[PDB]
Design a protein around this ligand. Sequence first.
Ligand SMILES: COc1cccc(CN2CCc3cc(OS(N)(=O)=O)c(OC)cc3C2)c1
Ligand SMILES: [Zn+2]
Ligand SMILES: [Zn+2]
Length: 254
Amino acid sequence: HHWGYGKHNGPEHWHKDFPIAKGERQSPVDIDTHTAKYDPSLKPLSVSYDQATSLRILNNGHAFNVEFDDAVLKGGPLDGTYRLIQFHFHWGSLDGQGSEHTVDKKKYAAELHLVHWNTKYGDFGKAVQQPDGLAVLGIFLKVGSAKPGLQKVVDVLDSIKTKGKSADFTNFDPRGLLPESLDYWTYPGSLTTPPLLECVTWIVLKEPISVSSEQVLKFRKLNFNGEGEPEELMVDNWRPAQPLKNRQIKASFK
Ligand SMILES: COc1cccc(CN2CCc3cc(OS(N)(=O)=O)c(OC)cc3C2)c1
Ligand SMILES: [Zn+2]
Ligand SMILES: [Zn+2]
């Protein structure tokens, strides 16, 4: 019985193996624009991805991720430097849902997560045990014009349809996944999948990227299951918004 997104192993069940699921700084959250506070101490985000070295893409039975040779994220709300280790997405069974964070309860079609670990901890495994161990950059996807920087990703999905499948994915530039503006919201939170560790500074961009219906449809062709098994379509791999508790969401923009 391995965690998943289904009726019998989904987000409502996770707390039984991972009690921190009911913790004080869980993610994602709804971003309420009536209450999110502008904060002048917040610097512009520094995204330095020109030296990013992608390695492979893998269907892990939950999502797909692109792994990097650990590119740096710094500035913004962060002290010191964070290394890019991987990215992945969460998405829906229809365009009207799929994101993890929401904005005034609005769900986007998907959400991109660029995962970075704090270099002061030496490696990812040590970083996740610290409250400031990770910085995840979250970017909403809406349906509109195609995002050319995403094309390499969606085109490769046919070759990694089922759990365990991987493909070479060298020379992918994550800079092609960013919107124009780096205006952001930020709050202290957690990983949104088991083990749900409370080790993340969340940085969620205000501006969504536009992807085409054709592109996002390709996400929905992936399988949760392995080859030669009952077909379980990979859709709705998102955790709902969690209690904000005693936290404050700050905005970098007025
Ligand atoms: C330990 O080195 C790794 C290198 C590449 C991929 C991984 C797997 N892991 C990294 C961090 C992470 C973190 C995640 O939490 S999230 N949604 O970004 O808050 C996650 O949920 C979908 C998945 C993963 C995948 C580990
Ligand atoms: Zn798994
Ligand atoms: Zn994620």
